[PDB]
Amino acid sequence: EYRLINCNTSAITQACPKVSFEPIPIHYCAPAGFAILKCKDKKFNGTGPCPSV
Amino acid sequence: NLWVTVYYGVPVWKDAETTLFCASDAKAYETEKHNVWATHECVPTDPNPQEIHLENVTEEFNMWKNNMVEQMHTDIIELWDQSLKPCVKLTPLCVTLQCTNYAPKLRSMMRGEIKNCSFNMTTELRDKKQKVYSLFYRLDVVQINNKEYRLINCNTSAITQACPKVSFEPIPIHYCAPAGFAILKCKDKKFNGTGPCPSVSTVQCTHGIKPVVSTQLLLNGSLAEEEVIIRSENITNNAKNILVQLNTPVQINCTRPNNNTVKSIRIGPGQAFYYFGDVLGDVRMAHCNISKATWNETLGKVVKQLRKHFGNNTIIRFAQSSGGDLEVTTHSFNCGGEFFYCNTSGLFNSTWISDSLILPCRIKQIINMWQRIGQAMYAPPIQGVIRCVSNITGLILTRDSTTETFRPGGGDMRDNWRSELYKYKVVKIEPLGVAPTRCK
Amino acid sequence: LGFLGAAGSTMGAASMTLTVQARNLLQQHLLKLTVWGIKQLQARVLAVEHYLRDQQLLGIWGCSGKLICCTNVPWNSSWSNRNLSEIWDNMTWLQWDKEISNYTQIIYGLLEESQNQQEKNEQDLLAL
Amino acid sequence: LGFLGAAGSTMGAASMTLTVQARNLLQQHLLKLTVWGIKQLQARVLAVEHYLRDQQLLGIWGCSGKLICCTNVPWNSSWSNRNLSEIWDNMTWLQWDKEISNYTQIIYGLLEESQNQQEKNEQDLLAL
Amino acid sequence: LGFLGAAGSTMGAASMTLTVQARNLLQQHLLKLTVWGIKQLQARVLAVEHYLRDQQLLGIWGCSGKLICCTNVPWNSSWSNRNLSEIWDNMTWLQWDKEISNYTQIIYGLLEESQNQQEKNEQDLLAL
Ligand SMILES: *[C@@H]1O[C@H](CO)[C@@H](O[C@@H]2O[C@H](CO)[C@@H](O[C@@H]3O[C@H](CO)[C@@H](O)[C@H](O[C@H]4O[C@H](CO)[C@@H](O)[C@H](O)[C@@H]4O[C@H]4O[C@H](CO)[C@@H](O)[C@H](O)[C@@H]4O)[C@@H]3O)[C@H](O)[C@H]2NC(C)=O)[C@H](O)[C@H]1NC(C)=O
Ligand SMILES: *[C@@H]1O[C@H](CO)[C@@H](O[C@@H]2O[C@H](CO)[C@@H](O)[C@H](O)[C@H]2NC(C)=O)[C@H](O)[C@H]1NC(C)=O
Ligand SMILES: *[C@@H]1O[C@H](CO)[C@@H](O[C@@H]2O[C@H](CO)[C@@H](O)[C@H](O)[C@H]2NC(C)=O)[C@H](O)[C@H]1NC(C)=O
Ligand SMILES: *[C@@H]1O[C@H](CO)[C@@H](O[C@@H]2O[C@H](CO)[C@@H](O)[C@H](O)[C@H]2NC(C)=O)[C@H](O)[C@H]1NC(C)=O
Ligand SMILES: *[C@@H]1O[C@H](CO)[C@@H](O[C@@H]2O[C@H](CO)[C@@H](O)[C@H](O)[C@H]2NC(C)=O)[C@H](O)[C@H]1NC(C)=O
Ligand SMILES: *[C@@H]1O[C@H](CO)[C@@H](O[C@@H]2O[C@H](CO)[C@@H](O)[C@H](O)[C@H]2NC(C)=O)[C@H](O)[C@H]1NC(C)=O
Ligand SMILES: *[C@@H]1O[C@H](CO)[C@@H](O[C@@H]2O[C@H](CO)[C@@H](O)[C@H](O)[C@H]2NC(C)=O)[C@H](O)[C@H]1NC(C)=O
Ligand SMILES: *[C@@H]1O[C@H](CO)[C@@H](O)[C@H](O)[C@H]1NC(C)=O
Ligand SMILES: *[C@@H]1O[C@H](CO)[C@@H](O)[C@H](O)[C@H]1NC(C)=O
Ligand SMILES: *[C@@H]1O[C@H](CO)[C@@H](O)[C@H](O)[C@H]1NC(C)=O
Ligand SMILES: *[C@@H]1O[C@H](CO)[C@@H](O)[C@H](O)[C@H]1NC(C)=O
Ligand SMILES: *[C@@H]1O[C@H](CO)[C@@H](O)[C@H](O)[C@H]1NC(C)=O
Ligand SMILES: *[C@@H]1O[C@H](CO)[C@@H](O)[C@H](O)[C@H]1NC(C)=O
Ligand SMILES: *[C@@H]1O[C@H](CO)[C@@H](O)[C@H](O)[C@H]1NC(C)=O
Ligand SMILES: *[C@@H]1O[C@H](CO)[C@@H](O)[C@H](O)[C@H]1NC(C)=O
Ligand SMILES: *[C@@H]1O[C@H](CO)[C@@H](O)[C@H](O)[C@H]1NC(C)=O
């Protein structure tokens, strides 16, 4: 006798067999009164003053 | 000769309804993740109590038409409903119960009270069932005619597991009004309930309010400041209830002195509920204590306030409450996971002319909060013992020749909050003004 | 005094407190939706238009910017002609305001017509 | 006439109706969420910025407050030079407006540059 | 240059770029509610008051409309008296701003009191 994994812990949802999963490129617009900075410095450390902002 | 001169920023208002929102005192909780009252996702209170006094101005209030009551009583039902939603529905619980008494050889008041029971509970598999032994109370099961028992709910409502990580401790809540509005404050001692407070002031955001649920009395509340204060709406009517505020508290101790055991059974793929498994030690009644001589001295202050404007040459007779549901009959309160029902017949057996005390207390499991037939919450049991200590602040009465009967009443939860919102009303600021002056 | 500090005061005494009345108008970014987030969203909205609807009216009435300005329409003395030198610095704002209240609608449409219709044409009439 | 009362009228005749056009802009407190409460929430929002985005523009164009004001940038006569004494009080607003419509973007950036860039410096240049 | 184009520039050089800084402030009608509609609703709101709270302040400070205007309160020279002819067109806005930052709260309440309380009474005092 076998048994599924989920029944230990969770419940099961059918995954809607018409939708897809292809990762669409997403842009992120900031609202007004705000801005998004950009480093643009090559070889950026992770934490440092980007000069070419 | 005179022309109309406009004015902006005039200190003048009207009275209006508006939406109004939370304000928490910012703490570091991080234990029960979120309680029933959403203190998380609430704005932290400014620790600057800006309380601006108003000079030589009066305003008649009404504690009987505060829409702040109806806004908050909407919200307390709704927050309760909101947190109760994502937990386990005990749909397959409503089965036929084989039961018997738990301590069959017992002489005390607890005889025939706790009932051992038996199930066929559906497991997480579809075709596997399970015989389950558990314990229940008299006030949860109903006979059908080891006679077959059945729960109360299945007459009317459905069952939700009560999310056994959250708490129920009433956090003090402040109410900040939005901009362009203000909240008035009476500040007059011995305020009638409807009258011009002379000593008014105003704030943006009220003081702490603990939204406790209680019947027949007012636990944990706010004190008075001068004496016993009586309030009602129509003192000559028998339909209006009676609001009593006390200048001093009474320290009530309450306990559920049983060392218990909670078991757990997965009943679905993730649905695992908790039930009152076993009692260590032996079975003990739950009760509450009160200083008797303090309370008579407390009650002696009350009748003096009664005989001022009502029944001077007339006896004052207290009777036990009449009957109906337990919520409208007896004292009922949550105290952090348990719902007590303490009989209060030993506090209303008294008349007047011209060494502690013990109240027996019952507890339930299945709760019908705010008289909503359709909803029924199953609280989980709690391990260990309960050691609730509380004050008292208020009293809810009703009036039934030269004889007077005062029976203890309750029922509407909104009357709990009129005891906290009589000091306030909501005004809409008007920054306009037009006067004639000497300029063109 | 403070915000609403001169509430039961003389109109001339409460003339010099308008800045504190106007500063104490209009937080948490990244709201959720559940219960209190609705009210805080409602708190953000109601502060806007109740600030703004009269802010429209001063542009309607030509008294743009914070000015205790006066118009060119004469005061009609049918509107409780009571010692307008004397009573202007006697009673309060408050009790005087509901006395005016039966005719304030009649005033306002004349305000937007008196100098706001007429005297806003005539500078174009001399703009040659 | 009324709100939009002078719609098909002379521009000079419809010059003297701007107050009724502006009064008839911008209720129920304590909203729920269900269906119509969404739209009434959406009704409150859209009235704000559509009132406000041009209200920004008059501060951009320096014509703050309700004024039929004029600029200092000259009219370019390449933009349909048609009898600007005659046609200015002949046709309508309406049919004249779409004639202008191909160049209005070009106008507006020059408006914020002409007196709004230049003539807003020079009072500081004489502020000594 | 462009929006924020003169960011690391001279304050006098970056004096003449304020219009591009103000135009690039504040779509889709008929929103749903689901996920992104929440954020776009939140995007509409936050643009309003962050435009508006300082727009209140210029009316508070009497500098209504876009004006680089100056007050009548004197500069207290305890606030880093550093060559105020020289340094005013030397460094930047940016690094100079955090130098001022410890006292800006003290300034602003004096701004609404200096000409905004006092000099807004006295035209009524000569209005006779
Ligand atoms: C009126 O006001 C008074 C204030 O004076 C209130 O009295 C206080 O009530 C609270 C709660 O009833 C009580 O707090 C308990 O104190 C114990 C001793 O420190 C704590 O051990 C206990 O914490 C446990 O329970 C909490 C709730 O479940 C949990 O949040 C907490 O993490 C602990 O839980 C662990 O332990 C239990 C043990 O069974 C276990 O089941 C859990 O799973 C977990 O492992 C309480 O916090 C105060 O001590 C009371 N103060 C006084 C002076 O008495 C009174 O309640 C108010 N009246 C009313 C009606 O509310
Ligand atoms: C409830 O009653 C049942 C009756 O069967 C009890 O179950 C038996 O208890 C005895 C001693 O307690 C055990 O020796 C048996 O093995 C139990 N039977 C089964 C099938 O397990 C049960 O103990 C009672 N509940 C409590 C809490 O005492
Ligand atoms: C306290 O409230 C009561 C009502 O609950 C007031 O009683 C009536 O008040 C009205 C108006 O003041 C009078 O016309 C009635 O004659 C009063 N009836 C009685 C039986 O007193 C009472 O006046 C209030 N008291 C104060 C001091 O405000
Ligand atoms: C319950 O009542 C007691 C008094 O009977 C309160 O204790 C007082 O609390 C105030 C406010 O913190 C203190 O100033 C007093 O010194 C306290 N008195 C004593 C004797 O301790 C207590 O705070 C009340 N508790 C609740 C939860 O209401
Ligand atoms: C308060 O309730 C009393 C009843 O106890 C009302 O008094 C009677 O009201 C009925 C109906 O209005 C009248 O027919 C009687 O004549 C009243 N009796 C007296 C002695 O007045 C009273 O009207 C109620 N008052 C308020 C303010 O609600
Ligand atoms: C309720 O219980 C608490 C403790 O269980 C009582 O507190 C004690 O009170 C006595 C006298 O009042 C003091 O001498 C003790 O020091 C107190 N102990 C603690 C730990 O506080 C309280 O008095 C009880 N209340 C009543 C009405 O009996
Ligand atoms: C609280 O306890 C009292 C104890 O007396 C109960 O009162 C008794 O109730 C029964 C049922 O009606 C009567 O037959 C007795 O005559 C009552 N006793 C007395 C002395 O009157 C009371 O029922 C209990 N409270 C509740 C809600 O059940
Ligand atoms: C259930 O989970 C436990 C750990 O949570 C794991 O040890 C066990 O193997 C799991 N059982 C099944 C059937 O997956
Ligand atoms: C449980 O099921 C068994 C067999 O189906 C039956 O004999 C027993 O009476 C049932 N007990 C209960 C409490 O339903
Ligand atoms: C069901 O409700 C009715 C009244 O609504 C009541 O008389 C009856 O006793 C209830 N039955 C059970 C089993 O609780
Ligand atoms: C309850 O029983 C357990 C059994 O291990 C014991 O550890 C605990 O101290 C008991 N608690 C009380 C309050 O008796
Ligand atoms: C309560 O006190 C009063 C006087 O203070 C007395 O007449 C009465 O008998 C007392 N009652 C009890 C139950 O002690
Ligand atoms: C009231 O108390 C007395 C004794 O204190 C007792 O004899 C009497 O039966 C009681 N009556 C009620 C209604 O509780
Ligand atoms: C003043 O108002 C009255 C009505 O109260 C009106 O009859 C009268 O014509 C008005 N006076 C003027 C000058 O408009
Ligand atoms: C007027 O617009 C035309 C384009 O239609 C352009 O070529 C011309 O230079 C403009 N005149 C002026 C003075 O800018
Ligand atoms: C300038 O600020 C200092 C504090 O840094 C203060 O002591 C001094 O009085 C201020 N000067 C004036 C003229 O207000």
PDB file of C-alpha atoms in Angstrom, chain B residues 2-13 18-22 38 41-43 52 54-57 75 78-79 82 175 178-180 204 428-437 439-440, chain C residues 2-5 7-8 18 21-22 25-26 32 34-36 39-40 42-43 46-47 50-51 53-55 58 61 63 66 68-75 84 88 93-94 96-97 107-108 111:
ATOM      1  CA  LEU B   2     -19.352  97.232   5.835  1.00  0.00           C
ATOM      2  CA  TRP B   3     -18.131  94.542   3.480  1.00  0.00           C
ATOM      3  CA  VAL B   4     -17.921  90.795   3.881  1.00  0.00           C
ATOM      4  CA  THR B   5     -14.525  89.676   5.180  1.00  0.00           C
ATOM      5  CA  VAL B   6     -13.548  86.040   4.872  1.00  0.00           C
ATOM      6  CA  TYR B   7     -11.708  84.092   7.574  1.00  0.00           C
ATOM      7  CA  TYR B   8      -9.715  80.883   7.280  1.00  0.00           C
ATOM      8  CA  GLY B   9      -8.812  78.704  10.228  1.00  0.00           C
ATOM      9  CA  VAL B  10     -11.711  79.686  12.480  1.00  0.00           C
ATOM     10  CA  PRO B  11     -11.928  77.456  15.569  1.00  0.00           C
ATOM     11  CA  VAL B  12     -15.494  76.186  15.030  1.00  0.00           C
ATOM     12  CA  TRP B  13     -16.960  72.728  14.470  1.00  0.00           C
ATOM     13  CA  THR B  18     -16.530  59.688  10.452  1.00  0.00           C
ATOM     14  CA  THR B  19     -14.271  56.708  10.038  1.00  0.00           C
ATOM     15  CA  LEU B  20     -11.786  56.234  12.847  1.00  0.00           C
ATOM     16  CA  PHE B  21      -8.783  54.000  13.294  1.00  0.00           C
ATOM     17  CA  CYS B  22      -6.438  52.149  15.642  1.00  0.00           C
ATOM     18  CA  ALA B  38      -4.546  43.127  15.311  1.00  0.00           C
ATOM     19  CA  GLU B  41      -0.635  46.389  11.363  1.00  0.00           C
ATOM     20  CA  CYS B  42      -1.679  49.209  13.658  1.00  0.00           C
ATOM     21  CA  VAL B  43       0.008  52.597  13.836  1.00  0.00           C
ATOM     22  CA  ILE B  52      -5.347  70.779  25.058  1.00  0.00           C
ATOM     23  CA  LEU B  54     -10.710  74.350  26.467  1.00  0.00           C
ATOM     24  CA  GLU B  55     -11.465  77.447  28.501  1.00  0.00           C
ATOM     25  CA  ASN B  56     -14.924  78.739  29.548  1.00  0.00           C
ATOM     26  CA  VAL B  57     -16.930  76.813  26.962  1.00  0.00           C
ATOM     27  CA  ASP B  75     -15.203  46.190  14.335  1.00  0.00           C
ATOM     28  CA  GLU B  78     -15.422  41.817  12.401  1.00  0.00           C
ATOM     29  CA  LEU B  79     -11.894  41.410  13.785  1.00  0.00           C
ATOM     30  CA  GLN B  82     -11.380  37.929  10.472  1.00  0.00           C
ATOM     31  CA  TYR B 175      -8.482  55.560  18.750  1.00  0.00           C
ATOM     32  CA  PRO B 178      -8.290  61.474  11.127  1.00  0.00           C
ATOM     33  CA  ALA B 179      -7.163  64.949  10.178  1.00  0.00           C
ATOM     34  CA  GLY B 180      -9.770  67.648   9.947  1.00  0.00           C
ATOM     35  CA  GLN B 204      -6.517  63.649  18.649  1.00  0.00           C
ATOM     36  CA  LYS B 428     -15.843  67.970  12.286  1.00  0.00           C
ATOM     37  CA  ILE B 429     -13.602  71.017  12.174  1.00  0.00           C
ATOM     38  CA  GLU B 430     -14.791  73.960  10.074  1.00  0.00           C
ATOM     39  CA  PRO B 431     -11.994  76.407   9.170  1.00  0.00           C
ATOM     40  CA  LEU B 432     -14.252  79.013   7.575  1.00  0.00           C
ATOM     41  CA  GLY B 433     -15.753  82.284   8.699  1.00  0.00           C
ATOM     42  CA  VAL B 434     -17.315  85.391   7.171  1.00  0.00           C
ATOM     43  CA  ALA B 435     -17.730  88.641   9.121  1.00  0.00           C
ATOM     44  CA  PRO B 436     -18.359  92.255   8.139  1.00  0.00           C
ATOM     45  CA  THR B 437     -15.416  94.608   8.684  1.00  0.00           C
ATOM     46  CA  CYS B 439     -12.405  97.360   4.314  1.00  0.00           C
ATOM     47  CA  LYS B 440     -13.313  97.107   0.666  1.00  0.00           C
TER      48      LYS B 440
ATOM     49  CA  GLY C   2      -2.380  75.552  21.300  1.00  0.00           C
ATOM     50  CA  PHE C   3      -4.481  73.882  18.642  1.00  0.00           C
ATOM     51  CA  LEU C   4      -8.075  75.027  19.219  1.00  0.00           C
ATOM     52  CA  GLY C   5      -6.587  76.936  22.142  1.00  0.00           C
ATOM     53  CA  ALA C   7     -11.914  78.341  21.123  1.00  0.00           C
ATOM     54  CA  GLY C   8     -14.086  80.255  23.569  1.00  0.00           C
ATOM     55  CA  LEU C  18      -4.828  80.799  12.557  1.00  0.00           C
ATOM     56  CA  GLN C  21      -5.221  75.873  13.353  1.00  0.00           C
ATOM     57  CA  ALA C  22      -3.820  75.091   9.896  1.00  0.00           C
ATOM     58  CA  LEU C  25      -3.902  69.056   9.525  1.00  0.00           C
ATOM     59  CA  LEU C  26      -2.335  66.274   7.392  1.00  0.00           C
ATOM     60  CA  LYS C  32      -2.038  45.361   3.636  1.00  0.00           C
ATOM     61  CA  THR C  34      -7.226  43.274   6.123  1.00  0.00           C
ATOM     62  CA  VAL C  35      -9.177  45.392   8.595  1.00  0.00           C
ATOM     63  CA  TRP C  36      -7.225  48.305   9.944  1.00  0.00           C
ATOM     64  CA  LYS C  39      -9.506  52.390   7.840  1.00  0.00           C
ATOM     65  CA  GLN C  40      -6.012  53.805   7.411  1.00  0.00           C
ATOM     66  CA  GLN C  42      -9.925  55.699   4.592  1.00  0.00           C
ATOM     67  CA  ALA C  43      -8.005  57.951   6.942  1.00  0.00           C
ATOM     68  CA  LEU C  46     -10.826  61.873   4.059  1.00  0.00           C
ATOM     69  CA  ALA C  47      -7.959  64.122   5.050  1.00  0.00           C
ATOM     70  CA  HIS C  50     -11.767  67.902   3.524  1.00  0.00           C
ATOM     71  CA  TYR C  51      -8.540  69.818   3.198  1.00  0.00           C
ATOM     72  CA  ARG C  53     -12.845  71.362  -0.999  1.00  0.00           C
ATOM     73  CA  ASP C  54     -12.506  74.683   0.799  1.00  0.00           C
ATOM     74  CA  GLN C  55      -9.079  75.115  -0.737  1.00  0.00           C
ATOM     75  CA  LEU C  58     -10.656  80.305  -1.809  1.00  0.00           C
ATOM     76  CA  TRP C  61     -13.540  83.357  -3.878  1.00  0.00           C
ATOM     77  CA  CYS C  63      -8.711  84.847  -1.827  1.00  0.00           C
ATOM     78  CA  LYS C  66      -3.587  82.312   3.331  1.00  0.00           C
ATOM     79  CA  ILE C  68      -7.558  87.220   5.958  1.00  0.00           C
ATOM     80  CA  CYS C  69      -8.794  89.129   2.944  1.00  0.00           C
ATOM     81  CA  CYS C  70     -11.954  91.103   2.435  1.00  0.00           C
ATOM     82  CA  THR C  71     -14.271  91.299  -0.513  1.00  0.00           C
ATOM     83  CA  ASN C  72     -16.012  94.175  -2.249  1.00  0.00           C
ATOM     84  CA  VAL C  73     -19.594  92.996  -1.734  1.00  0.00           C
ATOM     85  CA  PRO C  74     -21.305  95.087   0.970  1.00  0.00           C
ATOM     86  CA  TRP C  75     -22.612  93.565   4.143  1.00  0.00           C
ATOM     87  CA  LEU C  84     -21.029  95.351  14.407  1.00  0.00           C
ATOM     88  CA  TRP C  88     -17.360  91.786  16.586  1.00  0.00           C
ATOM     89  CA  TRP C  93     -16.751  82.860  17.056  1.00  0.00           C
ATOM     90  CA  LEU C  94     -18.916  79.931  18.061  1.00  0.00           C
ATOM     91  CA  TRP C  96     -22.048  84.052  16.585  1.00  0.00           C
ATOM     92  CA  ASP C  97     -21.606  81.476  13.829  1.00  0.00           C
ATOM     93  CA  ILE C 107     -23.538  84.848   0.836  1.00  0.00           C
ATOM     94  CA  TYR C 108     -21.265  82.396  -0.930  1.00  0.00           C
ATOM     95  CA  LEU C 111     -19.029  86.037  -3.206  1.00  0.00           C
TER      96      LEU C 111
END
